[PDB]
Each structure stands twice: as C-alpha cells, then as structure tokens.
C-alpha cells in the first residue's frame, strides 16, 4: 500500500534531527 511507504518518510525526518545536537 502506498500509505505503508509513507511511514518510511517520517523516519527520514528523524535522522535529520540527530545533527541538530551538534548545532545545539
């Protein structure tokens, strides 16, 4: 189902947050 594929996109956003700590 395409909706199932969409869930994976949210995980991509989470990896972006990790480098945020370095800026912090």
Notes on the protein architecture:
It comes from Homo sapiens (Human). This is Bone marrow stromal antigen 2. It is found in: Golgi apparatus, trans-Golgi network; Cell membrane; Membrane raft; Cytoplasm. The chain has one helix at 2-23. It is built from 1 helix and no strands. The protein has 24 residues and is mostly helical. Helices cover 92% and strands 0% of the residues. It is rod-shaped and about 40 Å long.
Write the topology of this structure.
Layout: H1 2-23
Subcellular location: Golgi apparatus, trans-Golgi network; Cell membrane; Membrane raft; Cytoplasm
Family: Belongs to the tetherin family.
Organism: Homo sapiens
Distance between the termini: 38 Å
Largest sheet, if any? none
Helix-strand category: mainly alpha
What oligomeric state is this? Answer: monomer
What is the string of helix and strand elements?
Answer: H
Q: Give the helix level as a range of percent.
A: over 70%
How many helices? The count is 1
Q: Would you count the extended β strands for me?
A: 0
**Share of residues in strands:** under 5%
Shape: rod-shaped
Computed CA radius of gyration, to the nearest angstrom: 12 Å
Brief overview:
Belongs to the tetherin family. The protein has 24 residues and is mainly α.
Any descriptors?
24 residues, mainly alpha, Bone marrow stromal antigen 2
């Amino acid at each position: 189902l395409l909706l199932g594929i969409g869930i994976l996109v949210l995980l991509i956003i989470v990896i972006l947050g990790v480098p945020l700590i370095i800026f912090t």
